Design a binder for this molecule. Sequence first.
Ligand SMILES: OC[C@H]1O[C@H](O[C@H]2O[C@H](CO)[C@@H](O)[C@H](O)[C@H]2O)[C@H](O)[C@@H](O)[C@@H]1O
Lengths: 142, 142
Amino acid sequence: QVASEYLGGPGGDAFDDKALAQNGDITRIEMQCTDVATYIKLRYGKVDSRQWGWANENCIQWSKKGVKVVHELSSGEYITSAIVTYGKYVQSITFKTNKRTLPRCGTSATEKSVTVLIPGGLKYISGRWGCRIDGLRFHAKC
Amino acid sequence: EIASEYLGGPGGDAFDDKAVAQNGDITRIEMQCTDVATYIKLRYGKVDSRQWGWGNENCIQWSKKGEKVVHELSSGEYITSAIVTYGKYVQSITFKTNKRTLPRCGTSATEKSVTVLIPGGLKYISGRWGCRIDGLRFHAKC
Ligand SMILES: OC[C@H]1O[C@H](O[C@H]2O[C@H](CO)[C@@H](O)[C@H](O)[C@H]2O)[C@H](O)[C@@H](O)[C@@H]1O
Protein backbone atom coordinates (compact mmCIF):
# COMPACT_ATOMS: atom_id res chain seq x y z
CA GLN A 1 0.00 0.00 0.00
CA VAL A 2 0.95 3.60 -0.48
CA ALA A 3 3.16 4.95 2.27
CA SER A 4 4.36 8.37 3.37
CA GLU A 5 8.02 9.21 3.54
CA TYR A 6 9.93 8.24 6.67
CA LEU A 7 9.76 11.09 9.19
CA GLY A 8 12.64 11.13 11.69
CA GLY A 9 16.13 9.71 12.11
CA PRO A 10 18.45 6.72 11.70
CA GLY A 11 18.53 5.78 15.38
CA GLY A 12 16.75 2.93 17.16
CA ASP A 13 15.53 -0.34 15.63
CA ALA A 14 13.14 -0.77 12.72
CA PHE A 15 9.54 -1.82 13.23
CA ASP A 16 6.76 -2.38 10.71
CA ASP A 17 3.20 -3.23 11.71
CA LYS A 18 2.37 -4.60 8.24
CA ALA A 19 1.83 -8.20 9.37
CA LEU A 20 0.19 -7.19 12.63
CA ALA A 21 -2.30 -5.13 10.66
CA GLN A 22 -3.85 -8.33 9.26
CA ASN A 23 -5.60 -8.61 12.63
CA GLY A 24 -7.87 -5.73 11.61
CA ASP A 25 -8.59 -2.01 11.40
CA ILE A 26 -6.80 0.27 13.83
CA THR A 27 -9.12 0.27 16.84
CA ARG A 28 -7.03 2.05 19.45
CA ILE A 29 -4.10 4.45 19.71
CA GLU A 30 -1.83 4.11 22.72
CA MET A 31 1.08 6.53 23.23
CA GLN A 32 3.25 7.87 26.05
CA CYS A 33 3.42 11.65 26.02
CA THR A 34 5.48 14.32 27.80
CA ASP A 35 7.23 17.20 26.05
CA VAL A 36 7.88 14.60 23.31
CA ALA A 37 6.15 11.40 22.29
CA THR A 38 8.13 8.51 23.78
CA TYR A 39 6.25 5.51 22.46
CA ILE A 40 3.39 4.51 20.18
CA LYS A 41 1.38 1.24 20.23
CA LEU A 42 -1.61 0.85 17.89
CA ARG A 43 -4.25 -1.88 18.22
CA TYR A 44 -5.19 -3.81 15.09
CA GLY A 45 -8.55 -5.43 15.70
CA LYS A 46 -8.04 -6.75 19.25
CA VAL A 47 -4.24 -7.16 18.97
CA ASP A 48 -1.75 -4.55 20.17
CA SER A 49 1.57 -4.08 18.45
CA ARG A 50 4.65 -4.18 20.58
CA GLN A 51 5.47 -0.99 22.46
CA TRP A 52 7.39 1.06 19.89
CA GLY A 53 9.47 3.19 22.20
CA TRP A 54 10.51 3.69 25.83
CA ALA A 55 12.64 0.60 25.51
CA ASN A 56 13.45 0.38 29.22
CA GLU A 57 12.92 2.38 32.38
CA ASN A 58 16.54 3.60 32.34
CA CYS A 59 15.57 5.69 29.28
CA ILE A 60 14.71 8.41 31.82
CA GLN A 61 18.37 9.42 31.55
CA TRP A 62 17.78 11.00 28.13
CA SER A 63 14.20 12.37 28.16
CA LYS A 64 11.23 12.42 30.44
CA LYS A 65 8.81 9.45 30.31
CA GLY A 66 5.29 10.93 30.16
CA VAL A 67 1.77 9.73 30.72
CA LYS A 68 0.07 6.85 28.95
CA VAL A 69 -2.61 8.21 26.61
CA VAL A 70 -5.24 5.87 25.12
CA HIS A 71 -7.61 6.83 22.32
CA GLU A 72 -10.16 4.13 21.52
CA LEU A 73 -11.62 4.32 18.03
CA SER A 74 -15.18 3.34 17.24
CA SER A 75 -16.04 1.02 14.39
CA GLY A 76 -15.84 2.87 11.10
CA GLU A 77 -13.50 5.45 12.64
CA TYR A 78 -10.10 5.79 10.98
CA ILE A 79 -7.11 8.12 11.13
CA THR A 80 -7.22 10.60 8.23
CA SER A 81 -4.46 13.06 9.20
CA ALA A 82 -1.19 13.02 11.09
CA ILE A 83 0.73 16.18 12.00
CA VAL A 84 4.29 15.26 13.00
CA THR A 85 7.00 17.57 14.23
CA TYR A 86 10.35 15.87 13.84
CA GLY A 87 14.06 16.04 13.41
CA LYS A 88 16.51 13.41 14.58
CA TYR A 89 13.50 11.87 16.36
CA VAL A 90 9.76 12.24 16.28
CA GLN A 91 8.96 15.11 18.62
CA SER A 92 5.15 15.34 18.60
CA ILE A 93 2.27 13.47 16.93
CA THR A 94 -1.22 14.90 16.38
CA PHE A 95 -3.76 12.46 14.91
CA LYS A 96 -7.19 13.25 13.48
CA THR A 97 -9.86 10.72 12.55
CA ASN A 98 -12.93 10.97 10.40
CA LYS A 99 -14.83 11.56 13.66
CA ARG A 100 -12.46 13.22 16.13
CA THR A 101 -9.46 15.55 16.57
CA LEU A 102 -7.13 13.91 19.03
CA PRO A 103 -4.77 15.87 21.30
CA ARG A 104 -1.11 16.20 20.42
CA CYS A 105 1.21 13.67 22.02
CA GLY A 106 4.24 15.77 22.89
CA THR A 107 3.72 19.28 24.23
CA SER A 108 6.69 20.71 22.32
CA ALA A 109 6.00 21.34 18.64
CA THR A 110 9.04 23.46 17.77
CA GLU A 111 10.66 21.07 15.31
CA LYS A 112 9.79 21.22 11.61
CA SER A 113 6.19 20.15 10.95
CA VAL A 114 4.64 17.91 8.28
CA THR A 115 0.93 17.24 7.74
CA VAL A 116 0.18 13.84 6.16
CA LEU A 117 -3.36 13.33 4.81
CA ILE A 118 -4.57 9.72 4.50
CA PRO A 119 -7.88 9.66 2.64
CA GLY A 120 -9.75 6.49 3.50
CA GLY A 121 -7.82 5.99 6.70
CA LEU A 122 -4.46 4.84 7.99
CA LYS A 123 -3.88 1.10 7.70
CA TYR A 124 -0.70 0.75 9.81
CA ILE A 125 2.59 2.41 10.86
CA SER A 126 6.24 1.53 10.53
CA GLY A 127 9.31 3.39 11.65
CA ARG A 128 12.11 3.13 14.15
CA TRP A 129 12.14 3.03 17.92
CA GLY A 130 14.34 2.88 20.96
CA CYS A 131 14.07 4.94 24.12
CA ARG A 132 11.69 7.08 22.10
CA ILE A 133 10.26 7.21 18.57
CA ASP A 134 13.16 7.70 16.14
CA GLY A 135 10.84 7.88 13.14
CA LEU A 136 7.44 7.08 11.72
CA ARG A 137 5.98 6.15 8.39
CA PHE A 138 2.26 6.08 7.56
CA HIS A 139 0.76 3.34 5.34
CA ALA A 140 -2.58 3.84 3.62
CA LYS A 141 -5.10 1.11 2.91
CA CYS A 142 -4.20 0.53 -0.75
CA GLU B 1 -14.38 5.28 -3.70
CA ILE B 2 -12.06 7.57 -1.67
CA ALA B 3 -11.20 11.19 -2.38
CA SER B 4 -8.96 13.59 -0.54
CA GLU B 5 -10.36 16.72 0.96
CA TYR B 6 -10.52 19.82 -1.20
CA LEU B 7 -7.22 21.72 -1.02
CA GLY B 8 -7.46 25.37 -2.07
CA GLY B 9 -9.81 28.31 -2.18
CA PRO B 10 -13.37 29.02 -3.27
CA GLY B 11 -12.52 30.96 -6.43
CA GLY B 12 -12.78 30.08 -10.09
CA ASP B 13 -15.05 27.38 -11.51
CA ALA B 14 -15.49 23.74 -10.57
CA PHE B 15 -14.05 20.97 -12.75
CA ASP B 16 -14.22 17.20 -12.42
CA ASP B 17 -12.43 14.56 -14.44
CA LYS B 18 -14.60 11.57 -13.48
CA ALA B 19 -16.14 11.20 -16.94
CA VAL B 20 -12.90 11.69 -18.93
CA ALA B 21 -11.11 9.33 -16.62
CA GLN B 22 -13.15 6.47 -18.07
CA ASN B 23 -10.64 6.61 -20.97
CA GLY B 24 -7.94 4.93 -18.87
CA ASP B 25 -5.34 5.12 -16.16
CA ILE B 26 -3.36 8.33 -15.94
CA THR B 27 -0.50 8.22 -18.46
CA ARG B 28 1.01 11.71 -18.19
CA ILE B 29 0.88 14.89 -16.12
CA GLU B 30 0.91 18.23 -17.91
CA MET B 31 1.37 21.41 -15.93
CA GLN B 32 2.44 25.03 -16.35
CA CYS B 33 5.00 26.09 -13.77
CA THR B 34 6.43 29.38 -12.50
CA ASP B 35 6.77 30.44 -8.88
CA VAL B 36 3.34 28.73 -8.79
CA ALA B 37 1.48 26.08 -10.77
CA THR B 38 -0.89 27.90 -13.13
CA TYR B 39 -2.63 24.94 -14.79
CA ILE B 40 -2.86 21.16 -14.68
CA LYS B 41 -4.00 18.80 -17.44
CA LEU B 42 -3.89 15.02 -16.97
CA ARG B 43 -4.15 12.41 -19.73
CA TYR B 44 -6.47 9.47 -19.07
CA GLY B 45 -5.36 6.71 -21.33
CA LYS B 46 -4.96 8.60 -24.60
CA VAL B 47 -7.42 11.41 -23.77
CA ASP B 48 -6.59 14.75 -22.15
CA SER B 49 -8.87 16.79 -19.95
CA ARG B 50 -9.39 20.44 -20.71
CA GLN B 51 -6.69 22.76 -19.41
CA TRP B 52 -7.58 23.44 -15.77
CA GLY B 53 -6.01 26.84 -15.19
CA TRP B 54 -4.46 29.77 -17.09
CA GLY B 55 -7.90 30.53 -18.55
CA ASN B 56 -6.79 33.51 -20.68
CA GLU B 57 -3.49 34.99 -21.87
CA ASN B 58 -4.59 38.21 -20.12
CA CYS B 59 -4.16 36.44 -16.80
CA ILE B 60 -0.61 37.86 -16.99
CA GLN B 61 -2.09 41.10 -15.77
CA TRP B 62 -2.42 39.32 -12.37
CA SER B 63 0.11 36.46 -12.11
CA LYS B 64 3.09 35.03 -13.93
CA LYS B 65 2.49 32.35 -16.56
CA GLY B 66 5.29 29.76 -16.52
CA GLU B 67 6.56 27.07 -18.83
CA LYS B 68 4.88 23.85 -19.89
CA VAL B 69 6.10 20.68 -18.16
CA VAL B 70 5.14 17.12 -19.13
CA HIS B 71 5.82 14.00 -17.06
CA GLU B 72 5.21 10.81 -18.99
CA LEU B 73 4.40 7.85 -16.75
CA SER B 74 5.61 4.41 -17.71
CA SER B 75 3.11 1.58 -18.07
CA GLY B 76 2.05 0.50 -14.61
CA GLU B 77 3.39 3.68 -13.01
CA TYR B 78 0.82 5.43 -10.83
CA ILE B 79 0.71 8.64 -8.83
CA THR B 80 0.83 7.80 -5.15
CA SER B 81 1.21 11.16 -3.37
CA ALA B 82 1.15 14.92 -3.89
CA ILE B 83 2.81 17.55 -1.74
CA VAL B 84 0.49 20.53 -2.19
CA THR B 85 1.12 24.01 -0.85
CA TYR B 86 -2.00 26.13 -0.93
CA GLY B 87 -4.01 28.98 0.44
CA LYS B 88 -6.49 30.95 -1.64
CA TYR B 89 -5.11 28.96 -4.59
CA VAL B 90 -2.92 25.99 -5.16
CA GLN B 91 0.64 27.31 -5.01
CA SER B 92 2.88 24.33 -5.76
CA ILE B 93 2.48 20.64 -6.51
CA THR B 94 5.05 17.88 -6.14
CA PHE B 95 3.78 14.57 -7.48
CA LYS B 96 5.28 11.24 -6.50
CA THR B 97 4.65 7.91 -8.19
CA ASN B 98 5.23 4.34 -7.03
CA LYS B 99 8.64 4.63 -8.73
CA ARG B 100 9.88 8.20 -8.27
CA THR B 101 9.51 11.62 -6.72
CA LEU B 102 8.94 14.10 -9.56
CA PRO B 103 10.02 17.73 -9.86
CA ARG B 104 7.88 20.25 -8.01
CA CYS B 105 5.68 22.52 -10.10
CA GLY B 106 5.95 25.95 -8.51
CA THR B 107 9.29 27.09 -7.11
CA SER B 108 7.57 28.92 -4.23
CA ALA B 109 6.35 26.47 -1.57
CA THR B 110 5.74 28.99 1.19
CA GLU B 111 2.05 28.48 1.92
CA LYS B 112 0.50 25.76 4.09
CA SER B 113 1.83 22.42 2.95
CA VAL B 114 0.16 19.05 3.06
CA THR B 115 1.30 15.58 1.87
CA VAL B 116 -1.68 13.73 0.39
CA LEU B 117 -1.42 9.98 0.23
CA ILE B 118 -3.39 8.61 -2.70
CA PRO B 119 -4.27 4.98 -1.82
CA GLY B 120 -3.98 2.60 -4.74
CA GLY B 121 -2.84 5.36 -7.01
CA LEU B 122 -4.54 8.44 -8.41
CA LYS B 123 -7.62 7.77 -10.56
CA TYR B 124 -8.55 11.35 -11.45
CA ILE B 125 -8.62 14.88 -10.13
CA SER B 126 -11.35 17.41 -9.47
CA GLY B 127 -11.20 20.98 -8.18
CA ARG B 128 -11.61 24.57 -9.32
CA TRP B 129 -9.80 26.72 -11.84
CA GLY B 130 -9.57 30.11 -13.51
CA CYS B 131 -6.40 32.08 -14.18
CA ARG B 132 -4.84 29.62 -11.69
CA ILE B 133 -5.59 26.35 -9.94
CA ASP B 134 -8.00 27.45 -7.23
CA GLY B 135 -8.07 24.03 -5.65
CA LEU B 136 -7.59 20.33 -6.11
CA ARG B 137 -9.15 17.11 -4.88
CA PHE B 138 -7.43 13.78 -5.49
CA HIS B 139 -9.67 10.81 -6.27
CA ALA B 140 -7.88 7.58 -5.44
CA LYS B 141 -8.39 4.08 -6.74
CA CYS B 142 -9.21 3.04 -3.19
O1 LIG C 1 19.44 3.97 27.70
C1 LIG C 1 19.82 3.18 26.57
C2 LIG C 1 20.17 4.09 25.40
O2 LIG C 1 19.13 5.03 25.22
C3 LIG C 1 19.36 6.03 24.23
O3 LIG C 1 19.55 5.47 22.93
C4 LIG C 1 18.57 4.67 22.35
O4 LIG C 1 17.34 5.35 22.09
C5 LIG C 1 17.43 6.28 21.03
C6 LIG C 1 16.07 6.92 20.82
O5 LIG C 1 15.09 5.92 20.56
C7 LIG C 1 17.88 5.61 19.74
O6 LIG C 1 18.12 6.63 18.78
C8 LIG C 1 19.17 4.84 19.94
O7 LIG C 1 19.50 4.14 18.75
C9 LIG C 1 19.02 3.89 21.11
O8 LIG C 1 20.27 3.29 21.39
C10 LIG C 1 20.58 6.83 24.66
O9 LIG C 1 20.82 7.85 23.70
C11 LIG C 1 21.78 5.92 24.80
O10 LIG C 1 22.90 6.61 25.33
C12 LIG C 1 21.48 4.77 25.74
O11 LIG C 1 22.56 3.83 25.67
